[PDB]
Write an enzyme that holds these catalytic residues in place. Structure first.
Site, PDB file in Angstrom:
ATOM      1  N   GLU A 240      -5.784   6.878  -1.798  1.00  0.00           N
ATOM      2  CA  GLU A 240      -5.797   5.808  -0.763  1.00  0.00           C
ATOM      3  C   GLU A 240      -6.329   4.428  -1.292  1.00  0.00           C
ATOM      4  O   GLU A 240      -5.758   3.405  -1.021  1.00  0.00           O
ATOM      5  CB  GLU A 240      -6.645   6.269   0.496  1.00  0.00           C
ATOM      6  CG  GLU A 240      -5.807   7.119   1.470  1.00  0.00           C
ATOM      7  CD  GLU A 240      -4.438   6.485   1.751  1.00  0.00           C
ATOM      8  OE1 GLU A 240      -4.521   5.287   2.177  1.00  0.00           O
ATOM      9  OE2 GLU A 240      -3.465   7.132   1.867  1.00  0.00           O
TER      10      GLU A 240
ATOM     11  N   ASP B  15      -9.278  13.951   8.638  1.00  0.00           N
ATOM     12  CA  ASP B  15      -8.584  13.004   7.745  1.00  0.00           C
ATOM     13  C   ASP B  15      -8.384  13.560   6.370  1.00  0.00           C
ATOM     14  O   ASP B  15      -8.720  12.925   5.377  1.00  0.00           O
ATOM     15  CB  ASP B  15      -9.421  11.711   7.619  1.00  0.00           C
ATOM     16  CG  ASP B  15      -8.671  10.551   7.010  1.00  0.00           C
ATOM     17  OD1 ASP B  15      -7.480  10.426   7.056  1.00  0.00           O
ATOM     18  OD2 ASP B  15      -9.444   9.673   6.463  1.00  0.00           O
TER      19      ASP B  15
ATOM     20  N   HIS C  40      -9.094   8.385   4.136  1.00  0.00           N
ATOM     21  CA  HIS C  40      -9.116   7.024   4.544  1.00  0.00           C
ATOM     22  C   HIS C  40     -10.537   6.530   4.767  1.00  0.00           C
ATOM     23  O   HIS C  40     -10.723   5.325   4.985  1.00  0.00           O
ATOM     24  CB  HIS C  40      -8.288   6.707   5.809  1.00  0.00           C
ATOM     25  CG  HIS C  40      -6.828   6.990   5.591  1.00  0.00           C
ATOM     26  ND1 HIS C  40      -6.282   8.241   5.832  1.00  0.00           N
ATOM     27  CD2 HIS C  40      -5.818   6.153   5.185  1.00  0.00           C
ATOM     28  CE1 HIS C  40      -4.964   8.149   5.570  1.00  0.00           C
ATOM     29  NE2 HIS C  40      -4.672   6.908   5.201  1.00  0.00           N
TER      30      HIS C  40
ATOM     31  N   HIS D 108       0.852  -1.208   0.000  1.00  0.00           N
ATOM     32  CA  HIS D 108       0.000   0.000   0.000  1.00  0.00           C
ATOM     33  C   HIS D 108       0.891   1.263   0.000  1.00  0.00           C
ATOM     34  O   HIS D 108       0.721   2.187  -0.798  1.00  0.00           O
ATOM     35  CB  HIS D 108      -0.873  -0.001   1.302  1.00  0.00           C
ATOM     36  CG  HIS D 108      -1.632   1.295   1.546  1.00  0.00           C
ATOM     37  ND1 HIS D 108      -3.050   1.372   1.444  1.00  0.00           N
ATOM     38  CD2 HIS D 108      -1.153   2.518   1.990  1.00  0.00           C
ATOM     39  CE1 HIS D 108      -3.359   2.678   1.709  1.00  0.00           C
ATOM     40  NE2 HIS D 108      -2.224   3.389   2.047  1.00  0.00           N
ATOM     41  N   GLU D 109       1.903   1.251   0.880  1.00  0.00           N
ATOM     42  CA  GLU D 109       2.801   2.382   0.959  1.00  0.00           C
ATOM     43  C   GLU D 109       3.600   2.603  -0.331  1.00  0.00           C
ATOM     44  O   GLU D 109       3.751   3.729  -0.833  1.00  0.00           O
ATOM     45  CB  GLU D 109       3.751   2.330   2.210  1.00  0.00           C
ATOM     46  CG  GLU D 109       3.053   2.125   3.605  1.00  0.00           C
ATOM     47  CD  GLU D 109       1.981   3.180   3.825  1.00  0.00           C
ATOM     48  OE1 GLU D 109       1.905   4.228   3.187  1.00  0.00           O
ATOM     49  OE2 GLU D 109       1.210   2.894   4.820  1.00  0.00           O
TER      50      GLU D 109
ATOM     51  N   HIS E 268       1.891   4.245  -3.107  1.00  0.00           N
ATOM     52  CA  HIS E 268       1.764   5.681  -3.014  1.00  0.00           C
ATOM     53  C   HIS E 268       2.909   6.331  -3.824  1.00  0.00           C
ATOM     54  O   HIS E 268       2.730   7.355  -4.475  1.00  0.00           O
ATOM     55  CB  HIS E 268       1.879   6.186  -1.555  1.00  0.00           C
ATOM     56  CG  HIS E 268       0.552   6.176  -0.776  1.00  0.00           C
ATOM     57  ND1 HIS E 268      -0.622   6.702  -1.310  1.00  0.00           N
ATOM     58  CD2 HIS E 268       0.233   5.691   0.459  1.00  0.00           C
ATOM     59  CE1 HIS E 268      -1.599   6.560  -0.409  1.00  0.00           C
ATOM     60  NE2 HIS E 268      -1.109   5.992   0.664  1.00  0.00           N
TER      61      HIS E 268
ATOM     62  N   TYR F 122      -3.409  14.749  -1.982  1.00  0.00           N
ATOM     63  CA  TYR F 122      -3.799  14.043  -0.790  1.00  0.00           C
ATOM     64  C   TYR F 122      -4.942  14.713  -0.044  1.00  0.00           C
ATOM     65  O   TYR F 122      -4.851  14.960   1.155  1.00  0.00           O
ATOM     66  CB  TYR F 122      -2.584  13.666   0.113  1.00  0.00           C
ATOM     67  CG  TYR F 122      -2.746  12.381   0.947  1.00  0.00           C
ATOM     68  CD1 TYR F 122      -2.957  11.121   0.371  1.00  0.00           C
ATOM     69  CD2 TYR F 122      -2.594  12.422   2.336  1.00  0.00           C
ATOM     70  CE1 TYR F 122      -3.033   9.962   1.157  1.00  0.00           C
ATOM     71  CE2 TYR F 122      -2.690  11.281   3.140  1.00  0.00           C
ATOM     72  CZ  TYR F 122      -2.888  10.032   2.548  1.00  0.00           C
ATOM     73  OH  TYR F 122      -2.930   8.895   3.343  1.00  0.00           O
TER      74      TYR F 122
HETATM   75 ZN   LIG Z   1      -2.145   5.358   2.237  1.00  0.00          ZN
END
Ligand SMILES: [Zn+2]
Ligand SMILES: [Ca+2]
Ligand SMILES: [Ca+2]
Ligand SMILES: [Ca+2]
Ligand SMILES: [Ca+2]
Length: 316
Positions: free
Chosen positions: A166, A226, A231, A142-143, A146, A157
């Protein structure tokens, strides 16, 4: 570091043994020379200054408990790099074999992981909410995704674009989890979250509402927390993606599944060719339809499923 490529062995966060690519030059370092310009893992030694010290070990064996998160961050980054290369023909996150760097033992009791624009960072968790985050291949992937987004669509973002950013990371982190065949599922972070509770996870793509995230556009979060719910609202897209893959009936709309592979092909094309930094959900749908069209023909079932899936979550 300049040295001789070799292979070491250790144990990961979950206790499993694995072989990892290292480099020998007096010490054995966590530096994998076999993938692009290299994968490098660093020790942040419970501090917040980055990246820390390139990981050095005396004997090429990584069985200490302090070693576990490094072993996994290093290993899972290799897997992810392989996924991208093998499956999408992309060399590293920039398409040009950029070195992949990660730091572990970031801060104290830090319950998160992230891509900071230059590298990956993993906390060890507080031991209750999380265990060291690099033990979850879906988290690692997931990271890293990005990074892929940053170099391609460049989705900002925040608000809808941020939610798409996300969702992209959860989708691809899940595809990677399936690629490696590591007990795959459509849940996010299950392997490192609440070690005390079995069966839960951070987010669910199959049923986002299980944890209170929206599974329909009419249920989106409109506030400011957020970053405007990056998210939270990712749940709507995640649900759409799960439906495209697996099929199902959602809010009375029936979707025939077309499988994971095509899901990935379609979203990767959308990401790399059609999305832009300020794309919104409605633009994502047009991008996804255009991609499937490109790939499978406008009168394809594939196109049809993409349409149904978005209609199902209320994205027009
Ligand atoms: Zn993320
Ligand atoms: Ca050792
Ligand atoms: Ca799993
Ligand atoms: Ca998972
Ligand atoms: Ca748990």
């Amino acid at each position: 570091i300049t040295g001789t490529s070799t292979v070491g062995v250790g144990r990961g966060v979950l206790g499993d043994q694995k072989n990892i690519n290292t480099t020998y030059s007096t010490y054995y370092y966590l530096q994998d020379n076999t993938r692009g310009d290299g994968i490098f893992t660093y020790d942040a030694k419970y501090r917040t200054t980055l990246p820390g010290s390139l990981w050095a070990d005396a004997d090429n064996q990584f069985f200490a408990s302090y070693d576990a998160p490094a072993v996994d961050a290093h290993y899972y980054a290799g897997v992810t790099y392989d996924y991208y290369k093998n499956v999408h023909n992309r060399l590293s996150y920039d398409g040009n074999n950029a070195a992949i760097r990660s730091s572990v033992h970031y801060s104290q009791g830090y319950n998160n992981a992230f891509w900071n624009g230059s590298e990956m960072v993993y906390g060890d968790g507080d031991g209750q909410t999380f265990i060291p985050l690099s033990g979850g291949i879906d988290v690692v992937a997931h990271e890293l995704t990005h990074a892929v987004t940053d170099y391609t669509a460049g989705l900002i973002y925040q608000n809808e674009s941020g939610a798409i950013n996300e969702a992209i990371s959860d989708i691809f982190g899940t595809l990677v989890e399936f690629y490696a065949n590591k007990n795959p599922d459509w849940e996010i972070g299950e392997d490192v979250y609440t070690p005390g509770i079995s069966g839960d996870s951070l987010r669910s793509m199959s049923d986002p509402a299980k944890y209170g995230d929206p599974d329909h556009y009419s249920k989106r979060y409109t506030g400011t927390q957020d970053n405007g719910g990056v998210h939270i609202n990712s749940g709507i897209i995640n649900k759409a993606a799960y439906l495209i893959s697996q099929g199902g009936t959602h809010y009375g709309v029936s979707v025939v599944g077309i499988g994971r592979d095509k899901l990935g092909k379609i979203f990767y094309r959308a990401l790399t060719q059609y999305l832009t930094p300020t794309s919104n959900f409605s633009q994502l749908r047009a991008a996804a339809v255009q991609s499937a069209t490109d790939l499978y023909g406008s009168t394809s079932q594939e196109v049809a499923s993409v349409k149904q899936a978005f209609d199902a979550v209320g994205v027009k």
